[PDB]
Design a binder for this molecule. Structure first.
Ligand code: HEM
Length: 153
C-alpha cells in the first residue's frame, strides 16, 4: 500500500543502512534486547550476553544483525512485490525460530529508533511515515503467511 513517493523515501533512508549494514544491525538488535528482554530468549547463541558491553563485543551478534538487515533490505528493495523474498523468511520464522508477530513489532520499533538516532537529519516526518508503512506492510505480509502456514498471525 505505499505510493511511489513513499517507496523512494524508504529506499533513500535505507541507503544509509546499506552504507553500514552490520553496525546498523548490531544497534537494532541491542535496542531490541534492551527494550524487550524476553526477545533475547529466542536466540540460544546469545544467552550468555549479560550486558550491553557483552552485546557490543559479540561477533556473532553483529554477524546476525548483518544477516537480518541484509534480508530486510532485499525485501524493501522489492517495494511490496516481495512475495519471493518474504516467503522463506516467514517460513523459517514461523517454524524454526518461533517468532511471534509481536516481536516483529518490537524489532520494527528498534529499526525506527536506530534510524532516528543515527540519521535525524535524513529521517524527517515524511521518511518516518513512509518507513513505518513499509515495516507495517512487512509485518502484515508475515502475519498473513503465518496464518496460511497454520500459525498465529
Ligand atoms: C526485520 C525482521 C527480521 C528479519 C529481516 C530477520 C531475518 C533473519 C534471517 C535472514 C535469518 C537467517 C536465515 C533464516 O533463518 O531465515 C534469521 C534468523 C533468525 N532470526 Fe530473524 N529476522 C527478523 C526478526 C527476528 C526477530 C524479531 C527475532 C527474535 C526476537 C528473530 C530471531 C531469529 C533467530 C533466533 C534466528 C536464527 C539465528 C541463529 O541462531 O543463527 N528474527 N532472521
Amino acid at each position: 500500500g505505499l505510493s511511489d513517493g513513499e517507496w523512494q523515501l524508504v529506499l533513500n533512508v535505507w541507503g544509509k543502512v546499506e552504507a553500514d549494514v552490520a553496525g546498523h544491525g548490531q544497534e537494532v538488535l541491542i535496542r531490541l534486547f534492551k527494550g524487550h528482554p524476553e526477545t533475547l530468549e529466542k536466540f540460544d547463541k546469545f544467552k550468555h550476553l549479560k550486558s550491553e558491553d557483552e552485546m557490543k563485543a559479540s561477533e556473532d551478534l553483529k554477524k546476525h544483525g548483518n544477516t537480518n538487515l541484509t534480508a530486510l533490505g532485499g525485501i524493501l528493495k522489492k517495494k511490496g512485490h516481495h512475495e519471493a523474498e518474504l516467503t522463506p523468511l516467514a517460513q523459517s520464522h514461523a517454524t524454526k525460530h518461533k517468532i511471534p508477530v509481536k516481536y516483529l513489532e518490537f524489532i520494527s520499533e528498534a529499526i525506527i529508533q536506530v534510524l532516528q538516532s543515527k540519521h535525524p537529519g535524513d529521517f524527517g516526518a515524511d521518511a518516518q511515515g513512509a518507513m513505518s508503512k513499509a515495516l507495517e506492510l512487512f509485518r502484515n505480509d508475515m502475519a498473513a503467511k503465518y496464518k496460511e502456514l497454520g500459525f498465529q498471525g
